[PDB]
Amino acid sequence: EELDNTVRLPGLANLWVPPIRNRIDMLSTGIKSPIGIKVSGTVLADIDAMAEQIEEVARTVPGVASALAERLEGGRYINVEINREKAARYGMTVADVQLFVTSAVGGAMVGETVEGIARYPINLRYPQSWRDSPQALRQLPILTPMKQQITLADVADIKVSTGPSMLKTENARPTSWIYIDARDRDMVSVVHDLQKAIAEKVQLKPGTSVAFSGQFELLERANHKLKLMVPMTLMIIFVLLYLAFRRVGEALLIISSVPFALVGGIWLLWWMGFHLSVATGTGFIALAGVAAEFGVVMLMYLRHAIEAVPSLNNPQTFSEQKLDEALYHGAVLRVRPKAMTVAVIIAGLLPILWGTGAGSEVMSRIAAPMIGGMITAPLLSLFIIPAAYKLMW
Amino acid sequence: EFIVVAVVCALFLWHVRSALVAIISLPLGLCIAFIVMHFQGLNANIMSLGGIAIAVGAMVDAAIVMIENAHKRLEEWQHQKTRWQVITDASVEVGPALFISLLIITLSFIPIFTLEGQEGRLFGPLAFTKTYAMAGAALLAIVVIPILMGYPLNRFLIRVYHPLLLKVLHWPKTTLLVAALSVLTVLWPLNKVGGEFLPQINEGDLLYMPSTLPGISAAEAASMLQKTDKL
Amino acid sequence: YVIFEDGTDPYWARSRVLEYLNQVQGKLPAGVSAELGPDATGVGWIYEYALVDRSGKHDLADLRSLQDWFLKYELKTIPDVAEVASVGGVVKEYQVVIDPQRLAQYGISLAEVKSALDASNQEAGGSSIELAEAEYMVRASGYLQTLDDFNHIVLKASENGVPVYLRDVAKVQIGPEMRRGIAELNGEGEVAGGVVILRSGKNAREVIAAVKDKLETLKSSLPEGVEIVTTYDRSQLIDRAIDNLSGKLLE
Amino acid sequence: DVQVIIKTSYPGQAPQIVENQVTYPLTTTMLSVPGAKTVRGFSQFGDSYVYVIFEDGTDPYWARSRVLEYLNQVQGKLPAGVSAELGPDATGVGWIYEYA
Amino acid sequence: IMSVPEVARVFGKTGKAETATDSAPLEMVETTIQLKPQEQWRPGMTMDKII
Numbered sequence A: 001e002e003l004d005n006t007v008r009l010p011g012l013a014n015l016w017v018p019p020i021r022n023r024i025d026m027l028s029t030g031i032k033s034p035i036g037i038k039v040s041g042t043v044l045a046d047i048d049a050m051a052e053q054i055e056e057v058a059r060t061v062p063g064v065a066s067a068l069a070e071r072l073e074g075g076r077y078i079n080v081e082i083n084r085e086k087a088a089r090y091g092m093t094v095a096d097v098q099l100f101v102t103s104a105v106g107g108a109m110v111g112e113t114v115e116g117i118a119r120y121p122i123n124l125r126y127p128q129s130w131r132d133s134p135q136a137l138r139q140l141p142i143l144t145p146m147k148q149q150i151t152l153a154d155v156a157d158i159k160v161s162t163g164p165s166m167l168k169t170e171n172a173r174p175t176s177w178i179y180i181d182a183r184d185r186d187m188v189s190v191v192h193d194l195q196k197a198i199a200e201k202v203q204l205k206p207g208t209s210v211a212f213s214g215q216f217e218l219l220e221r222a223n224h225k226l227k228l229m230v231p232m233t234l235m236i237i238f239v240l241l242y243l244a245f246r247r248v249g250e251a252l253l254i255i256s257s258v259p260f261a262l263v264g265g266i267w268l269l270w271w272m273g274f275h276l277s278v279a280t281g282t283g284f285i286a287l288a289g290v291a292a293e294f295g296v297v298m299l300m301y302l303r304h305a306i307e308a309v310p311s312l313n314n315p316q317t318f319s320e321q322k323l324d325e326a327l328y329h330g331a332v333l334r335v336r337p338k339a340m341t342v343a344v345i346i347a348g349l350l351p352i353l354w355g356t357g358a359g360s361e362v363m364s365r366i367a368a369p370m371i372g373g374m375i376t377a378p379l380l381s382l383f384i385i386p387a388a389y390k391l392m393w
Numbered sequence B: 001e002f003i004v005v006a007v008v009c010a011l012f013l014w015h016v017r018s019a020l021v022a023i024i025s026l027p028l029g030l031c032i033a034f035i036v037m038h039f040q041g042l043n044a045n046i047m048s049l050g051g052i053a054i055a056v057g058a059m060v061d062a063a064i065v066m067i068e069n070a071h072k073r074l075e076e077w078q079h080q081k082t083r084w085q086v087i088t089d090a091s092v093e094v095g096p097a098l099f100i101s102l103l104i105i106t107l108s109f110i111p112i113f114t115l116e117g118q119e120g121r122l123f124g125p126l127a128f129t130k131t132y133a134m135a136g137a138a139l140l141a142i143v144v145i146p147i148l149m150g151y152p153l154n155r156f157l158i159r160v161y162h163p164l165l166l167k168v169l170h171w172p173k174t175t176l177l178v179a180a181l182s183v184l185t186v187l188w189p190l191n192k193v194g195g196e197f198l199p200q201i202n203e204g205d206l207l208y209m210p211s212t213l214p215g216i217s218a219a220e221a222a223s224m225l226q227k228t229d230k231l
Numbered sequence C: 001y002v003i004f005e006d007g008t009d010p011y012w013a014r015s016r017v018l019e020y021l022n023q024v025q026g027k028l029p030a031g032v033s034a035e036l037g038p039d040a041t042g043v044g045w046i047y048e049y050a051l052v053d054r055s056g057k058h059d060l061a062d063l064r065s066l067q068d069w070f071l072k073y074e075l076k077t078i079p080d081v082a083e084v085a086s087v088g089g090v091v092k093e094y095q096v097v098i099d100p101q102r103l104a105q106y107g108i109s110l111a112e113v114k115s116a117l118d119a120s121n122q123e124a125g126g127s128s129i130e131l132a133e134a135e136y137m138v139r140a141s142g143y144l145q146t147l148d149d150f151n152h153i154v155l156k157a158s159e160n161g162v163p164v165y166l167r168d169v170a171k172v173q174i175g176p177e178m179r180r181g182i183a184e185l186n187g188e189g190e191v192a193g194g195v196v197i198l199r200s201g202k203n204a205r206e207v208i209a210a211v212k213d214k215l216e217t218l219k220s221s222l223p224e225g226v227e228i229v230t231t232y233d234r235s236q237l238i239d240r241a242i243d244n245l246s247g248k249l250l251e
Numbered sequence D: 001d002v003q004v005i006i007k008t009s010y011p012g013q014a015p016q017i018v019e020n021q022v023t024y025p026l027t028t029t030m031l032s033v034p035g036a037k038t039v040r041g042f043s044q045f046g047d048s049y050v051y052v053i054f055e056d057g058t059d060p061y062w063a064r065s066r067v068l069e070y071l072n073q074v075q076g077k078l079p080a081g082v083s084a085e086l087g088p089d090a091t092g093v094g095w096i097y098e099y100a
Numbered sequence E: 001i002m003s004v005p006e007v008a009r010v011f012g013k014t015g016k017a018e019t020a021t022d023s024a025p026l027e028m029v030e031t032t033i034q035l036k037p038q039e040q041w042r043p044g045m046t047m048d049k050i051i
């Protein structure tokens, strides 16, 4: 902040970033806007004219759309137009003047001198005085092959005009990119409206094509992909869950129980102010795993206790509340290690939340779910599991 | 993390060396993970080096439960060679549950391998290290018994717990409705998480870049650069 | 045609055969080159279409140019397309016919004409200058883009005289290139078209549907009086075989 | 991504010149290279760059071989006083040390 | 060829097609011929009959 406030020069917009991130971003020759419209054409004028309309055409459709046509038209070129008739009038071809344009004004290379392993270029050009201003170029002395001493303006005219600074070509064709973007919303439906609008109200010129791209595209796959696999993975849990119980009710109970710890864990980001991400998802997965461990293990103890002496009395007549005493002796053997695990987890994960070293905000993002869920998963196991267990008939 | 688990163990068991188990069970798992990566490269990035700090905490629970149950059954036998055999019996009576739990918390990370992309291939190594460490720790817990056999207050905890358990058991449906209320109220932070996803990694170094117009000379650029560097 | 043993990797063979392709480039004549083959086999030919004109407005040359510089650069955008090859049509050539009587009247050979032509179809470099701090690069003309421009060309100079112009010795026009491949529909008339290849070992139905919907969406921007007409598509045979096998399994 | 970089450094021109002189042949030739997900060409004052992008998971060196497979058909077609250099075997992360 | 009632679309080609796979000289002619749907050919008249 102090830096951004101190350095302020006109014509600049400051940005401060990590070096590696800036480099890898620089190197990324793609479109960073969530939505991008690529209009390809044979020439520049047609595509520019199309994009001119596309700007407001997209600005009209709902959804905030910062319609940017381009920012490349900023060049500055001389236009020395060779009047071929006049050059022929003095027995001079185009190349005869192109040469003077290249070397006498530009200073082209002619060869490299050797000094051992070092090669040094050789330049050839007129002095710096005759090539300072366009007016000075209009008087550029020239010697024809017939030794006719003339100037450049005698065969050509120089004019002033701006132009591009860089040109982009996708698939070896002139292409113009239009950036559109919203925020805090999924742009899944606006694309259809935009394409139908531009197809119905904006005509196309022979030799012009339109296409869409941007980050959104990859998302349409990613979600789909996980929306195809997450189910199967969950099934892989069921099959692997009742291998210790050999009955579906127990696995179903654990599966319906894990969301309590899920909520316990997710309720922390509000206090901490962080925001979900893939890493928070991995933290959620780990929290669910440890909660399933707690549930499975408590259920094993409950099943071992119910198989005790009361196994003969409970089926005799009815509930026989005395059976709850079994649960008593079935629960006292679990609070100690559970408290130990919770304490060690909390005391080991706290400094990561409250510490800043190297890549620490990330580690805090990944650790928040565990610390947030270790306050409910123990309660979950201790209380709700035996209730549903006794309610299982 | 090691020292805190050690002090916790020494506190809840009154100076027992069970802590050593962790120190000789959790690190070895890490090794296994690394070994796997060597068979398929996957150079250790920062995300991989970070995920292990949470993997170790996720894994210590098996050893904790094992040592707790072993000490419990030993103290129980105190009321009355083959002694360590019945200790191993009391360990295996719960072993398989812990093994299955570690296997499931391991296999629960495939959805990370599924997705693929710049961020996907950034995160992949993290989940790979996670799963490999979990599997290694599962094996070690399966073979954590030999190092195990090689080596007041909770009354208040049970006094506080048991009355609550007796109170709640008489009203299970109330607990189910409380869970319903919880899974209902969870909706508020979900819809207003915020934004600024995928935060940026801070570094002691920095890089400055201004957006500027194309036109610039060879001397004006040098002068502006010198002025900015001096400022 | 270079043939290797069986079981070897195709791309490895491509690398190994290109390993000896650079030692002959400079040894090859200037006005020629050595092109390599696509990444497909004879089976790669999957789709085939023709550009027909239900009128007498556009000429074969226009259709050939359209197919060469508009569609070829779009269908290939499809990822799995090996390559598209044009066929038929006419290649518009700017041909210059000479009159030997004029060459005799003015006494000029053809090598000088070639030299003059090779020095009148290019522009120069434009290294910038340090004017006012709004920098200002340079650019020259010299591209031949008009027949009137073709007519205003010098061949030999005559100090204090009149320079001989090309229009006085020759005549420029536009015509057809020396044809080597022609195509046609039924007795309707001649047409130009394209053929589509497929990368060795890839799905067909996907690329067929892709090219189909692409042509569908592209037919809008197509000029007036022009139509696409397909002639070959494996999708029909593929789905027929699939249906036959499914029915056999069901029965 | 996994991509290849091709550079050509001309002392001084205009973007249109290099565009219609050096970038057009390279792009039109590499359009038919295997594994090509998309080609891109940046024409700049004096220098011109070309970025070829393939699918994910492919071998980088295989992509280098495949993109060089279509680099010899344009050498002679390129002006004399220029050349076409290839990119190093690293990514933006390759920048490790810096001294003055 | 189109005179036959069963053929639907013909496409004749002579020479090559600006590709490396084809090497047909200016005399080798290859005529692709699409046939009408089997249900619509004629009474009987199998493929052998057509050829």
Ligand SMILES: [Cu+]
Pocket: A026, B209
């Ligand atoms: Cu930059």
